[PDB]
Amino acid sequence: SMNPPPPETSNPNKPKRQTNQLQYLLRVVLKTLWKHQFAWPFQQPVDAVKLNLPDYYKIIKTPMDMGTIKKRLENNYYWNAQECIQDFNTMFTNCYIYNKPGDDIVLMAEALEKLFLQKINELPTEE
Ligand SMILES: Oc1cccc(-c2[nH]c(-c3ccccc3)nc2-c2ccncc2)c1
Ligand SMILES: Oc1cccc(-c2[nH]c(-c3ccccc3)nc2-c2ccncc2)c1
């Protein structure tokens, strides 16, 4: 087995928009989560080859990671905040689906999710 290409992060055929909510997601949410002590396994796509997890992409058909989210944000890939929030949620869910509950990697994801939700709660009104 081999890794799939990473998720698309740039699409010239896809309308671009810059909003205060998207800006917050990049300059606050992404930035805060990236620097968290538990962030590192989520900073790039799961390398199933390097990690010897040959069944990862047999199970996870919608991979997502914060490296991809960073690229989508800085490329203005998203039209709205919900698209980005969905990517974060997918990342967390993938971890919970693939890994046994209570495993270290799951506990790390759970804490990151708690912080994510805390920052999402303070999402500024679309002005
Ligand atoms: O063999 C295992 C068991 C559990 C986690 C890891 C695991 N290890 C790493 C990792 C990431 C960066 C550097 C070094 C290791 N990332 C993961 C991972 C696995 C599944 N989803 C997200 C991240 C490897
Ligand atoms: O039970 C838990 C809960 C959370 C993280 C870990 C956790 N597990 C590991 C780890 C690292 C290498 C091999 C096997 C496990 N590192 C951490 C960790 C803890 C705190 N800060 C950074 C990394 C274990």
Give a description of the structure:
The protein is mostly helical and 127 residues long. The chain has a single domain (19-123), classed as Up-down Bundle (Histone Acetyltransferase, Chain A), CATH 1.20.920. The protein is 50% helix and 0% strand. It is built from five helices and no strands. Helix 1 (20-34) runs antiparallel to helix 3 (66-74). One 3-[2-phenyl-4-(pyridin-4-yl)-1H-imidazol-5-yl]phenol is lined by residues 40-41, 46, 51, 95, 98-99, 105. Residues 17-123 form the Bromo domain. The record marks 99 as: Acetylated histone binding. There is a cross-link at residue 58 (Glycyl lysine isopeptide (Lys-Gly) (interchain with G-Cter in SUMO2)). Belongs to the BET family. It comes from Homo sapiens (Human).
Quick structural summary:
The chain is 50% helix and 0% strand.
Any idea what the CATH superfamily is called? Answer: Bromodomain-like
Structural class: mainly alpha
Per CATH, what is the topology? Histone Acetyltransferase, Chain A
* CATH level-1 class: Mainly Alpha
Intertermini distance = 47 Å
Helix content: 40-55%
Characterize the biggest β-sheet.
Answer: none
Number of domains: 1
Q: If classified by CATH, what would the architecture be?
A: Up-down Bundle
Total number of strands:
0
* Cα radius of gyration in angstroms: 15 Å
Question: Which molecules are bound besides the chains?
Answer: 3-[2-phenyl-4-(pyridin-4-yl)-1H-imidazol-5-yl]phenol
Number of helices: 5
Q: Label the overall shape.
A: globular
Strand content: under 5%
Pattern of helices and strands = HHHHH
PDB class: transcription/inhibitor
Keywords: bromodomain, CAP, hunk1, protein binding-inhibitor complex, mitotic chromosome associated protein, cell cycle, inhibitor, TRANSCRIPTION-INHIBITOR complex
Assembly: monomeric
Entry title: Crystal structure of the first bromodomain of human BRD4 in complex with SB-610251-B
